[PDB]
């Protein structure tokens, strides 16, 4: 690809520069180039990859929701045409990320496996947000479910990756799978079991875990 001629270390370096500059499309391209080098990603490098594509698709999703809302309000073809254009671009990015996960990253340490399986569920979920669909939802559920099984066996309840996986799998249940009670149960059980495990909250993971715990409580407050 376009990044084939650049050193892996230089791609990682420029991904951090792009992050500081809030150039997330560049950031994602650099990290894709790094994945293409064929070596496994470190903990920090996985974070760079996830943050880059999370922000890229985040902007596309937000734009899609604005256009879809306008489209539904109208019950010419321009609104549909432009919404489909943003939708196609969004799907393309999701396909790019899913391709990286399945071709390179998903294979190992439970921390990395759960990380990538959460991503797989997330980007199938984003595909499901715009799908008009059952296959996509099933693929998201499988990834989330496998990640849940591993994290339950291999990771403590306060681990931020385990917490974030549960937060998103709960959101999946609520607004994708039309299972509000399952979403609520999962969020509550996750929050409660993490609250009883704070004695093992490890200095460099305290801020991430407590942040996600508050996001879990945010959703419970919204849904109950």
């Amino acid at each position: 690809g376009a990044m084939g001629s650049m050193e892996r270390a230089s791609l990682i370096q420029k991904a951090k520069l792009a992050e500081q500059a809030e150039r997330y499309e560049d950031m994602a391209a650099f990290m894709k180039g790094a994945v293409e080098k064929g070596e496994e990603l470190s903990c920090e490098e996985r974070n760079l990859l996830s943050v880059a594509y999370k922000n890229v698709v985040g902007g596309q999703r937000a734009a899609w929701r604005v256009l879809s809302s306008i489209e539904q309000k109208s019950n010419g073809p321009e609104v549909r045409e432009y919404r489909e254009k943003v939708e196609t671009e969004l799907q393309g990015v999701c396909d790019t990320v899913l391709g990286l996960l399945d071709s390179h990253l998903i294979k190992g340490d439970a921390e990395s496996r759960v990380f990538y399986l959460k991503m797989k569920g997330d980007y199938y979920r984003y595909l499901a947000e715009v799908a008009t669909k059952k296959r996509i939802i099933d693929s998201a559920r499988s990834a989330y479910q496998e990640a849940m099984d591993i994290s339950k066996k291999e990771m403590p309840p306060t681990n931020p990756i385990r917490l974030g996986l549960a937060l998103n799998f709960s959101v999946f249940h609520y607004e994708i799978a039309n299972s509000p009670e399952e979403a609520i149960s999962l969020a509550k059980t996750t929050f409660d079991e993490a609250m009883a495990d704070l004695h093992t909250l490890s200095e460099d993971s305290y801020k991430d875990s407590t942040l996600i715990m508050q996001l879990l409580r945010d959703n419970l407050t919204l849904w109950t």
Binding site: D122, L167, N168, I212, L215, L216, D218, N219
Partner: peptide, 5 residues
Amino acid sequence: RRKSV
């Protein structure tokens, strides 16, 4: 809007 991470 509900939270994800």
